[PDB]
Structure 1
Amino acid sequence: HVTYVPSQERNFTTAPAICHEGKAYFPREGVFVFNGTSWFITQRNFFSPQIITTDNTFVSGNCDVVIGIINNTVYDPL
């Protein structure tokens, strides 16, 4: 049997969702990570930082019901 074993763990600061002009952005697949400067989105099994854009996230509701939501910005490609 040939198998894949992950290794070399690293700790990050995470959030459930992000608020942006009164709307909540949840990731499609992946997790929100913080690297000391800004917030990125990454896959759970490998570390590959990506910029949080509108393609990465989706909108559901306003920001007064989710516990632990934070303020950040979302880059629109225009």
Structure 2
Amino acid sequence: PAICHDGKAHFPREGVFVSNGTHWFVTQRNFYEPQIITTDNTFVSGNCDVVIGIVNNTVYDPLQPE
């Protein structure tokens, strides 16, 4: 239901998180297309304690490298 990068639950702004076994991706509801889980397609709100079923994984910031 959410991804905890650093003590913060990342819910998907549109779509549901999926993983091809090892790597987690965001994809639409009625068509499968994997996209890397960045801060653009996910909105953070929470404390990574209340949500149940949250996996850790990681998110990619498109601004830090630049």
Q: Same fold (TM over 0.5)?
A: yes
Percent of pairs with identical residues:
87
- The Cα shift of 1:37 comes to 2.1
Normalising to structure 2: TM-score of the pair? 0.91
Q: Show structure 1 runs of 5+ residues with no match.
A: 1-15
Runs of 4+ aligned structure 1 residues displaced above 6 Å come to none
Match for 2:18 among 29, 33, 45?
Answer: 33
Normalising to structure 1: TM-score of the pair? 0.78
C-alpha RMSD of the superposition: 0.7
Q: Show structure 2 runs of 5+ residues with no match.
A: none
Higher relative contact order (CA 8 A, sep 6+): 2
**Which residues of 2 match residues 1-78 of structure 1 at below 5 A?**
16-78=1-63
Larger Rg belongs to? 1
Aligned residues: 63
